[PDB]
């Protein structure tokens, strides 16, 4: 990034500098203008490689992943205005500035040129997220969930510093990923277990295994104004990608102990989606979908040898757009009925006809209907771990079975009637309610034409 960070910091003395209620239109206007400039110099060529400027950028060359990070500040301000507009303007100016302040560090992350520039920016978050969790929620179990969001992420990430500083004075210096041409291999020892294990375990705490997922239906269940950092917290989970930067090199020959991470995350996949069909909180229904087919990448990274990196990259931004919109489907239809209980919202599909398509074309991407960005992602993972052992088609096939019965159970609960109650629920899904529900499927099915833009090196 030459200057993408330099205009997006200039967004920040624009909000408080403005007038009265113009502060919504002034921020969303200029924030869309970066989306040309974000595309502009990037997506260049392309054959080994694009080192970009200096010690501040390797341009996120083979993993683009960053254009999606820049949609969101002009996607969340139109989403958050539903129940925020009762507070003071002095705090309404705050909640826009820390949200930009979350996008600032993510921009120097994903590119980062190093491994120690990564960590200090990998941990430069979690302060502006925690402010959106504790203040601006609903009734309690915010505060323990504000502490479960810490102390998993921070307990794991401190043994990175013990190992990353250990590499910096062992073999040259880690400062470049392109001074990683000289790499000594890492054999089987009793100290080289822990060098592999401490460097890996801090990434498992964000993209969860079946164990230690205990913080993920805490922060997403009790959640800000209209999914306002919940859209950010789904990117941030897939923004722990850096295992793709590390483990491709830098102990390349330890598959010897991959097996307690395979079987835990391959049997957990078939169970943690099965454990959600009896959910009664609607925002906790989606929160376990995000566990399951995110954890398919963990058996797609540790199994090396691409035709998996074809798919493991496409799955990071598969439900980057899907699981964002599902939260937006549930951040809407809560402004009208004030419960997230899935029982209560019946009698629907007659009252709001125009958003019936927005339910289905969401839930038709988990069924995934092969010409999308989804079953071009899974069917490379399926054809990859087939070549590990043939038996893995069974568990991953039953993964495809249960999530078919799982996604429709959220659709079919709205196809009932007679509504019994509800003198409220009048608002016929206004112009904003369809606009921020659009711009999700409009790039999602568009990129299926030429999805060579979404591919690794590979």
């Amino acid at each position: 990034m030459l200057k993408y960070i330099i205009p997006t910091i200039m967004l920040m003395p624009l909000t408080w500098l403005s007038k009265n209620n113009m502060i919504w239109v002034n921020s969303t206007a200029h924030s869309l203008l970066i989306s040309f400039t974000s595309l502009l110099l990037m997506n260049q060529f392309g054959d080994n490689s694009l080192n970009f400027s200096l010690l501040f950028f390797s341009d996120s060359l083979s993993t683009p992943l960053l254009i999606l990070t820049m949609w969101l500040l002009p996607l969340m301000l139109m989403a958050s205005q539903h129940h925020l507009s009762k507070e003071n303007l002095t705090r309404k100016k705050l909640f826009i500035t820390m949200l930009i302040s979350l996008q600032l560090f993510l921009i120097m992350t994903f590119t980062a040129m190093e491994l120690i520039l990564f960590y200090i920016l990998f941990e430069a978050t979690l302060v502006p997220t925690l402010i959106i969790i504790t203040r601006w929620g609903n009734q309690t179990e915010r505060l323990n969930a504000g502490l479960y969001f810490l102390f998993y992420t921070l307990a794991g990430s401190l043994p990175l510093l013990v190992a990353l500083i250990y590499i910096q004075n062992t073999v040259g210096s880690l400062n470049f990923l392109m001074l990683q041409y000289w790499v000594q291999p890492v054999h089987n020892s009793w100290s080289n277990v822990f060098m592999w294990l401490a460097c890996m375990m801090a990434f498992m705490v964000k993209m969860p295994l079946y164990g230690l997922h205990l913080w993920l239906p805490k922060a997403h269940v009790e959640a800000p104004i209209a999914g306002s950092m919940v859209l950010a917290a789904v990117l941030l989970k897939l923004g722990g990608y850096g295992m793709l930067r590390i483990t491709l090199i830098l102990n390349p020959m330890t598959d010897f102990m991959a097996y307690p991470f395979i079987m835990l995350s391959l049997w957990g996949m078939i169970m943690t989606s099965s454990i959600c069909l009896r959910q009664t909180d609607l925002k906790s229904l989606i929160a376990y979908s995000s566990v399951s087919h995110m954890a398919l990448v963990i058996v797609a990274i540790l199994i090396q040898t691409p035709w998996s990196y074809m798919g493991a990259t496409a799955l990071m931004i598969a439900h980057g757009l899907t699981s964002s919109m599902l939260f937006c489907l549930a951040n809407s239809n809560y402004e009208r009925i004030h419960s997230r209980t899935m029982i209560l919202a019946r009698g629907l599909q007659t009252l709001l006809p125009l958003m019936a398509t927005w339910w289905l074309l969401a839930s038709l991407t988990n069924l995934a209907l092969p010409p999308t960005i989804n079953l071009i992602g899974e069917l490379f993972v399926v054809m990859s771990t087939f070549s590990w052992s043939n038996i893995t088609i069974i568990l991953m096939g039953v993964n495809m079975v249960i999530t078919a019965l799982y996604s429709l159970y959220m659709l079919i609960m709205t196809q009932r009637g007679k509504y019994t109650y509800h003198i409220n629920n009048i608002s016929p899904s206004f112009t904003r309610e369809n606009a921020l529900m659009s711009l999700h499927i409009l790039p999602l099915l568009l990129l299926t034409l030429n999805p060579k833009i979404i591919l690794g090196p590979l």
Partner: protein
């Protein structure tokens, strides 16, 4: 019955483990200026007997 129990049993045991031992160290420091100084002397003698400290 499992996901909220035997993953929630082992790690939030540690919350109730340290606060079991964060009570034995203010409620046994209950004043007793007579008993500060009887316990400084045990510390000053056990440094003589234990290890490297004279060597």
């Amino acid at each position: 019955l499992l996901d909220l129990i035997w993953l929630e049993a082992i790690l939030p045991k540690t919350i109730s483990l340290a606060q079991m031992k964060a009570s034995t160290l203010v409620t046994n420091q209950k004043g007793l200026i007579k008993l500060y100084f009887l316990s400084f002397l045990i510390t000053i003698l056990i440094s003589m007997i234990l290890f490297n400290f004279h060597e």
